[PDB]
């Protein structure tokens, strides 16, 4: 499938989506350190087989 | 669940394997989960989650 | 069987600069209190200096206010040295406002009963277009020594105000210290000595105030030096948590709606060790909770793996 | 404003006449300052009979 | 294969620490080794550290 730049990120808390706008891009002016998401992104990988 | 067995079994298959069947087995399951849900028990498995 | 010194003339010679002298000194103590005072004066002295700053239409240090001839990164670096002094207060937020083609000095601030702008000529920046206009919330705390900007984020926990530019904190008013003991004979004593401690302020510590709080530390340090109780600590902490640690985190973590967020502020519930044990019974009877209001709480408790309302014949233990 | 005074201080003595005292944790530079200053007084200006 | 790209530009401001290589114009290389307190610096009779 297509990879999406959505701000919808599996298994992340609001703690993350704070430096992030609705679209999924970090705000200008935002002071960030290691680990912080600059651009939320997700790739299609279906039927996992756990 | 497939736990240390090949396949996992339809909830009906399971009933016949115990002679007390149906909704009954469907409830034993839920209470057992419920049991592993809170703490003393809850702590350890929790940490596997991201 | 000993003597003890004291301080005769303290001689200012500038707002910035002054020679304080210490007369009754025995053989060699001159350099002894003298070096060990320079040592505690250049470091350990109290000071207030601007810590954070929000400026009108600017988002981070690396930008450009329209109509000013400095860049935000330079304007910060002018405040670092803004020499203020305040009294009863510990952190005071001064405000700066001015327009029109004209050098904005330190004097252009607004005064507080505690604010003393020890240098009002001090350049902050220059405007340069008739109706170009700046306004700012300068924030001053007061601490000890050198807290560089960077270390001032590990406390994070929502400093989000994008506007707030943190400046490196240079909290100290010693510029440079120099003692010299020239010998001084009180008329009769074989040989006692003087101690001229020349010092260089930013203007915001009065020599006497200093040299005193200096000597003070030396005492409290030497205090523990006097007797030596071999002292130690208990140690060996606990490796037995009863519950799942999850119940020691605050209700914010539940990442919930605002009307449901303050409402647990209300009914006295911070940690989720209390939300865990309050039934659905408890909730219509709580100020402002309903079908849409409480459906919300049964779903974020579902996701993390807990439930509403249960027990634990032991909450919360034990330190 | 307020300061740091040490903890854990173990005087380990070799023979009754000789001894070695260790003393942490001092604020920065405070080892040299207390150290040298106490050395000066221990050596030079200490009442005795010879 | 590519749909859209987000480039984020960061401004890290690096101070100075042991490890940095520094040198004068005369082929005198050298790597800052310890960062000392003003207290510990060599000073002259005018008090000004180096």
Curated annotation (Swiss-Prot), chain B:
Location comes to: Cytoplasm
Query: Where does the source fall among the domains of life?
Result: Bacteria
Q: Which residues bind DNA?
A: 11-30
Q: Looking at the record, which segments are called Interaction with anti-sigma factors?
A: 22-37
Q: Where is this region: Sigma-70 factor domain-4?
A: 1-38
Describe, as the record does, how this protein assembles with itself and its partners: Interacts transiently with the RNA polymerase catalytic core formed by RpoA, RpoB, RpoC and RpoZ (2 alpha, 1 beta, 1 beta' and 1 omega subunit) to form the RNA polymerase holoenzyme that can initiate transcription. Identified in a complex containing RpoD, the RNA polymerase subunits RpoA, RpoB and RpoZ, CRP and DNA. Interacts with Rsd; this prevents interaction with the RNA polymerase catalytic core and with promoter DNA, and as a consequence, promotes transcription from promoters that require alternative sigma factors. (Microbial infection) Interacts with Escherichia phage lambda antitermination protein Q.
By sequence similarity, the record places it as follows: Belongs to the sigma-70 factor family. RpoD/SigA subfamily.
Q: What is known of its domains?
A: Contains 4 domains, connected by flexible linkers. In the active conformation, the domains are in an extended conformation, each making extensive interactions with the RNA polymerase catalytic core.
Role this protein plays: Sigma factors are initiation factors that promote the attachment of RNA polymerase to specific initiation sites and are then released. This sigma factor is the primary sigma factor during exponential growth. Preferentially transcribes genes associated with fast growth, such as ribosomal operons, other protein-synthesis related genes, rRNA- and tRNA-encoding genes and prfB.
This protein is called RNA polymerase sigma factor RpoD
Report the source organism.
Answer: Escherichia coli (strain K12)
What's the gene?
A: rpoD
- Please give the range of the full-length protein represented by this chain: 563 to 612 of 613
Swiss-Prot record, chain C:
Name it.
DNA-directed RNA polymerase subunit alpha
What EC designation does it have? 2.7.7.6
Function per UniProt: DNA-dependent RNA polymerase catalyzes the transcription of DNA into RNA using the four ribonucleoside triphosphates as substrates.
User: SUPFAM superfamilies, per this entry?
Assistant: C-terminal domain of RNA polymerase alpha subunit, Insert subdomain of RNA polymerase alpha subunit, RBP11-like subunits of RNA polymerase
Q: Name one GO cellular component term.
A: DNA-directed RNA polymerase complex
Question: Transmembrane stretches, by residue range?
Answer: none
The GO terms describing molecular function are: DNA binding; DNA-directed RNA polymerase activity; protein dimerization activity
- Name any Gene Ontology BP term: DNA-templated transcription
Quaternary structure per UniProt?
Answer: Homodimer. The RNAP catalytic core consists of 2 alpha, 1 beta, 1 beta' and 1 omega subunit. When a sigma factor is associated with the core the holoenzyme is formed, which can initiate transcription.
Where are the stretches annotated Alpha N-terminal domain (alpha-NTD)?
1-229
Superkingdom is Bacteria
InterPro entries to which the protein is assigned, alphabetical: DNA-dir_RNA_pol_insert, DNA-dir_RNA_pol_RpoA/D/Rpb3, DNA-dir_RpoA, RBP11-like, RNAP_asu_C, RNApol_insert_sf
The record's comment about this protein's domains reads: The N-terminal domain is essential for RNAP assembly and basal transcription, whereas the C-terminal domain is involved in interaction with transcriptional regulators and with upstream promoter elements.
Question: In this record, what's one Pfam family?
Answer: RNA_pol_A_bac
Q: What class of enzyme is it?
A: transferase
HAMAP family for this protein: RNApol_bact_RpoA
The organism of origin for this protein? Escherichia coli O157:H7
Q: Which reaction equation describes what this protein catalyses?
A: RNA(n) + a ribonucleoside 5'-triphosphate = RNA(n+1) + diphosphate
Swiss-Prot record, chain E:
Its domain of life? Bacteria
Q: How does it assemble?
A: The RNAP catalytic core consists of 2 alpha, 1 beta, 1 beta' and 1 omega subunit. When a sigma factor is associated with the core the holoenzyme is formed, which can initiate transcription.
Task: Give the family per the record.
Answer: Belongs to the RNA polymerase beta chain family.
What job does the chain carry out? DNA-dependent RNA polymerase catalyzes the transcription of DNA into RNA using the four ribonucleoside triphosphates as substrates.
Its protein name is: DNA-directed RNA polymerase subunit beta
Species for this entry: Escherichia coli O157:H7
Q: Identify the segment of the full-length protein shown.
A: 1045 to 1094 of 1342
């Amino acid at each position: 499938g297509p990879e999406e730049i959505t701000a919808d990120i599996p298994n992340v808390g609001e703690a993350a989506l704070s430096k992030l706008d609705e679209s999924g891009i970090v705000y200008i002016g935002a002071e960030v350190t290691g680990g912080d998401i600059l651009v939320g992104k997700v790739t299609p990988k279906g039927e996992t087989q756990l | 669940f497939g736990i240390d067995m090949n396949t996992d079994y339809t909830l009906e298959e399971v009933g016949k394997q115990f002679d007390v069947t149906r909704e009954r087995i469907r409830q034993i399951e839920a209470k057992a989960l419920r049991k592993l849900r809170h703490p003393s028990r809850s702590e350890v498995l929790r940490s596997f989650l991201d | 069987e000993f003597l003890k010194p004291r301080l005769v003339d303290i001689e200012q010679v500038s707002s910035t600069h002054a020679k304080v002298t210490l007369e009754p000194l025995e053989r060699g103590f001159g350099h002894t209190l003298g070096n060990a005072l320079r040592r505690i004066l250049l470091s350990s002295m109290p000071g207030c200096a601007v810590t954070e700053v929000e400026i009108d239409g600017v988002l981070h240090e690396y930008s450009t206010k329209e109509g000013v001839q400095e860049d935000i990164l330079e304007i910060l670096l002018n405040l670092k040295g803004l020499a203020v002094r305040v009294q009863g207060k510990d952190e005071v937020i001064l405000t700066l406002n001015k327009s029109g083609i004209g050098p904005v000095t330190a004097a252009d601030i607004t005064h507080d009963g505690d604010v003393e702008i020890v240098k009002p000529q001090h350049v902050i920046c220059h405007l340069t277009d008739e109706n170009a206009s700046i306004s700012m919330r300068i924030k001053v705390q007061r601490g000890r020594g050198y807290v560089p900007a960077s270390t001032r984020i590990h406390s994070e926990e929502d400093e989000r105000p994008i506007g707030r530019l943190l400046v490196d904190a240079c909290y100290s008013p010693v510029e440079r210290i120099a003692y010299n003991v020239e010998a001084a004979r009180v008329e009769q004593r074989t040989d006692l000595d003087k101690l001229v401690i020349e010092m260089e302020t930013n203007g915001t510590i009065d020599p006497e105030e200093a040299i005193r709080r200096a000597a003070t530390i030396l005492a409290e340090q030497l205090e523990a030096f006097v007797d030596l109780r071999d002292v130690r600590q208990p140690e060996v902490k606990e490796e037995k948590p009863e519950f799942d640690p999850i119940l020691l985190r605050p209700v914010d973590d539940l990442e919930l709606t605002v009307r449901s967020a303050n409402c647990l502020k209300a009914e006295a519930i911070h940690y989720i060790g209390d939300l865990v044990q309050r039934t659905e019974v408890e909730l219509l009877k709580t100020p402002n909770l309903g079908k849409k209001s409480l459906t919300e709480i049964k779903d974020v408790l579902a996701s993390r793996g807990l439930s509403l309302g249960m027990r634990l014949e032991n909450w919360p233990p034990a330190s | 404003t307020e300061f740091l005074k040490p903890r854990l201080v173990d005087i380990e003595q070799v023979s009754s006449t000789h001894a070695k005292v260790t003393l942490e944790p001092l604020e920065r530079g405070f080892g040299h300052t207390l150290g040298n200053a106490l050395r000066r007084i221990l050596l030079s200006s200490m009442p005795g009979c010879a | 294969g590519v749909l859209k790209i987000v480039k984020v530009y960061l401004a890290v401001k690096r101070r100075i620490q042991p490890g940095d290589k520094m040198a004068g114009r005369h082929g005198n290389k050298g790597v800052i080794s310890k960062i000392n307190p003003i207290e510990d610096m060599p000073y002259d009779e005018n008090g000004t550290p180096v």
